[PDB]
Design a protein around this ligand. Structure first.
Ligand SMILES: CCCCCCCCCCCCCC(=O)O
Length: 90
């Protein structure tokens, strides 16, 4: 896991994460790839920190979009999309 790969995976989620609505196929696919790549505790902690960085790019981030993404994509998300998560607890 690198932050560049996290950014690539989550890029198609940016409109949903910033405007609400539904994630869409490309976003759900991106998140499933990420979730697939966060296979170890280290990978998960690393991904968590990169996702937190990404989430903190957008002053207009919709936290409830972020919170609804796993249910809308049908996945158990190992690394939640959050601006404030402490990644040590992942
Ligand atoms: C369970 C994941 C396998 C699906 C692989 C690509 C799916 C992309 C569209 C995602 C929509 C959610 C599907 C689902 O997990 O039920």
């Amino acid at each position: 896991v690198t932050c560049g790969q996290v950014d690539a995976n989550l890029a198609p989620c940016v409109p949903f994460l910033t405007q609400g609505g539904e994630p869409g196929a490309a976003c759900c696919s991106g998140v499933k790839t990420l979730n697939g790549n966060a296979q170890s505790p280290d990978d998960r902690k690393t991904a968590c920190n990169c996702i937190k960085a990404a989430a903190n790019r957008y002053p207009n981030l919709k936290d409830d979009a972020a919170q609804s993404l796993p249910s809308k994509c049908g996945i158990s998300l190992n690394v939640p999309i959050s601006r404030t998560i402490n990644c040590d607890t992942i």
